[PDB]
């Protein structure tokens, strides 16, 4: 979409920093240092980013469910406001081994989480000794903390929403085995390598990790909306 | 499954079975190991090494790994024109284009694996390690870049691939 | 390395295939017995095996196995021997043709006829 060219400049003038360390495999989109601070190249990034948004629009009519991974402290609040409701899922308490490949065990442990959470809230195990409630309380806590932003997920997702590759390589690894397209925002120490569409970015400046994500979020969500309204119209024409 | 070729009913090419144990910490290990190849007669990369506590579960794990994240390979049944100087972990093969009128000699189970591979006619004797696991790599690394043209335009064939890169 | 390098100094290969020192490129050979031996195995074992030393016609000397029950060798006779190594005993490179020269076939052999040298065997 046309949104990517306006979005990149407005966000980017923090320039990142990350000392002079940076990552050589991202280097073409990294402009040369000014006294041991890294500076991003904002011009070469606009073809990549416009490319990403057109593919997002085409999946809109394809998806009911999005999965946001690669979340971190400085980024969490932007990942929440893009999800809005339980048709858009996210992981922020670290990824678990097999969340896509062993969805079979993962969905089983989610079904035990929503069964014992609805048991807790009616009040059913809270009678007797504190030991008998607390051993259920602790196991529910571990499932709730591990699952909390994916607990509702009605099936294997159509896409993968990445805000960092820095700690989250596995999610991407399995998403590629599952045959899922990744739509990425990578930082300066990240590599561009190995995911389907990239936005080159930097991990600092809370205004930049929001604006980057804000552009990615609009295209799929108002995209889906427009597909649904076109679905209503096709039957309603007949009966009037 | 996923990117897998237009396969029809299962290939159940069991190549090997073994059983492994340290026995160091609590009696022996009972679990078994399996090596299995799943193709389609037209040329595939499907090769799966898997394991479980008893043989039936060992093969079914191994057969999944033989069939998921495997690219189509486009040879024409029994003719192939463009092999590779095949190397896998010291086990080395070097097929070249050839008539099927001439026949195939190959030892053990191997003339049988090669006839389901579609690569029997180009094939020539292995060299490097003659270990059961790596001797069968004829149809994987030896086809990793390939074509098999039937077209009268065979002499324009590399031209046709450049003007798509243009 | 280089091909010119191969014109300047040739290829040379692994050691050729031998374990029978019989001379004249032949599987069987004659000699006169010098000694008969009761002897004990190599590898971890206990037996009383039969070997003869024969002094072959080339004047070298070899040790040959005397297989099956029922001993008939004499320690100064002319016999034919056939190469075929024995791993049970150290440096034993031969077996003796039980049907040849001064040899007689094994008692309670019917397993093979020509092999271990029995004319119309007994049970």
């Amino acid at each position: 979409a046309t949104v990517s060219m306006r979005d990149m400049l407005k966000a980017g003038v923090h320039f990142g920093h990350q000392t002079r360390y940076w990552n050589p495999k991202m280097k073409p989109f990294i402009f040369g240092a000014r006294n041991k601070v890294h500076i991003i190249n904002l011009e070469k990034t606009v073809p990549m980013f416009n490319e990403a948004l057109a593919e997002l629009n085409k999946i809109a009519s394809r998806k009911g469910k999005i999965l946001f991974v690669g979340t971190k402290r400085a980024a969490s609040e932007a990942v929440k406001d893009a999800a809005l409701s339980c048709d858009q899922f996210f992981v922020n308490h670290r990824w678990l081994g097999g969340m896509l490949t062993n969805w079979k065990t993962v969905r089983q442990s989610i079904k035990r989480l929503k069964d014992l959470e609805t048991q807790s809230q009616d009040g059913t195990f809270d009678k007797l000794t504190k030991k008998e409630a607390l051993m259920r309380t602790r196991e529910l806590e571990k499932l709730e903390n591990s699952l909390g932003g994916i607990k509702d997920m009605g099936g294997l997702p159509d896409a993968l929403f990445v805000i960092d590759a820095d700690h989250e390589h596995i999610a991407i690894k399995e998403a590629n085995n599952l045959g899922i397209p990744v739509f990425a925002i990578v930082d300066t120490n990240s590599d561009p390598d190995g995911v389907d569409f990239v936005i080159p970015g930097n991990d600092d400046a809370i205004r930049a990790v929001t604006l980057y994500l804000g552009a990615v979020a609009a295209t799929v969500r108002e995209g889906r909306s427009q597909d649904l309204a076109s679905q209503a119209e096709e039957s309603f024409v007949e009966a009037e | 499954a996923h990117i897998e070729k237009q396969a029809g009913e299962l290939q159940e090419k069991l190549i090997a079975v073994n059983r492994v144990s340290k026995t160091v910490k609590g009696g022996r290990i009972f679990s078994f190991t399996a090596l299995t190849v799943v193709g389609d007669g037209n040329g595939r990369v499907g090769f799966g090494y898997g394991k479980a506590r008893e043989v039936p579960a060992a093969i079914q794990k191994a057969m999944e790994k033989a069939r998921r994240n495997m690219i189509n390979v486009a040879l024409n049944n029994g003719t192939l024109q463009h092999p590779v100087k095949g190397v896998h972990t010291g086990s080395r093969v070097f097929m070249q284009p050839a008539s099927e009128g001439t026949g195939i000699i190959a030892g053990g189970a191997m003339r049988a694996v090669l006839e389901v591979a579609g690569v029997h006619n180009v094939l020539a004797k292995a060299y490097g390690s003659t270990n059961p696991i790596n001797v069968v790599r004829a149809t994987i690394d030896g086809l990793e870049n390939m074509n098999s043209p039937e077209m009268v335009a065979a002499k324009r064939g590399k031209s046709v691939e450049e003007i798509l890169g243009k | 390395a280089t091909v010119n390098q191969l014109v300047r100094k040739p290829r040379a290969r692994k050691v050729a295939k031998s374990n029978v020192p019989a001379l004249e490129a032949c599987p069987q050979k004659r000699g006169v017995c010098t000694r008969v031996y009761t002897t004990t195995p190599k590898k971890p074992n206990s037996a009383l095996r039969k070997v003869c030393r024969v002094r072959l016609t080339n004047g070298f000397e070899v040790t040959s196995y005397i297989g099956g029950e029922g001993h008939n060798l004499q320690e100064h006779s002319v016999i034919l021997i056939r190469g075929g190594r024995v791993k049970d005993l150290p440096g034993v490179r031969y077996h003796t043709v039980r049907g040849a020269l001064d040899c007689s076939g094994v008692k309670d052999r019917k397993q093979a006829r020509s092999k271990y040298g029995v004319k119309r065997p007994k049970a």
């Binding site: - | 463009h82 590779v84 590399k158 890169g165 243009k166 | -």
Partner: protein, 129 residues
């Protein structure tokens, strides 16, 4: 130092296509042009220019189909010190004639198909895989 310059041409293409470069430049020769022409029409390079008023110098554009390599390697067979010559009746077969040997005959540089159509033999420069 410089002992075979058409193998050094070929190594510059070879690392060129593996390293995702669009064009590869080196010193030019009458032999280099004469080769490049055959590659250009058989699509093993896309196009080239020859440029330099002092001494000629060659810039060429690589073989691709999607953006990464579809010829694995190109190697010289006749070389400095190991010249190999083929007769009219003995012109070679490279990946069943989907691939080329570039063959310098007395009448010029051409492909194995044209050396055979002429009824010449000559020097076998390089094969594809």
């Amino acid at each position: 130092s410089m002992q075979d310059p058409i193998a050094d041409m070929l190594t510059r293409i070879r690392n060129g296509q593996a390293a995702n470069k669009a064009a590869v430049t080196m010193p030019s020769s009458k032999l280099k042009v004469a080769i490049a022409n055959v590659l250009k029409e058989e699509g093993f390079i896309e196009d080239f220019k020859v440029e330099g008023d002092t001494k000629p110098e060659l810039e060429l554009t690589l073989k691709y189909f999607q953006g990464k390599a579809v010829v694995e390697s190109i190697q010289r067979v006749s070389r400095p010190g190991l010249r190999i010559y083929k007769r009219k009746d003995e012109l070679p077969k490279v990946m069943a004639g989907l691939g080329i040997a570039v063959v310098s005959t007395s009448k010029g540089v051409m492909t194995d198909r044209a050396a055979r159509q002429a009824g010449l033999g000559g020097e076998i420069i390089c094969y594809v895989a």
